[PDB]
């Protein structure tokens, strides 16, 4: 059997959250981006994914 509870978000969390660049920079031979990767309180993120 699986765990009854205490491992599942019950409100509206988001699997596969998406982020898009808040800053961009392009050179003749490079591309530069930076995202405001906000994990958000009450959470934990693994960068393997």
């Amino acid at each position: 059997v699986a765990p009854t509870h205490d491992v599942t978000t019950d409100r509206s969390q988001r699997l596969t959250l998406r982020f898009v660049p808040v800053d961009r920079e392009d050179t003749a031979y490079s591309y530069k981006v930076r995202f405001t990767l906000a994990v958000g309180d009450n959470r934990v993120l693994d960068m393997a994914s």
Partner: peptide, 19 residues
């Protein structure tokens, strides 16, 4: 300190599940 948290949320086989 009127409780213990422990931690058993691990699937469950019976009264069990760790390591």
């Amino acid at each position: 300190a009127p409780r213990h948290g422990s931690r058993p949320f691990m699937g469950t086989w019976n009264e069990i599940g760790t390591s």
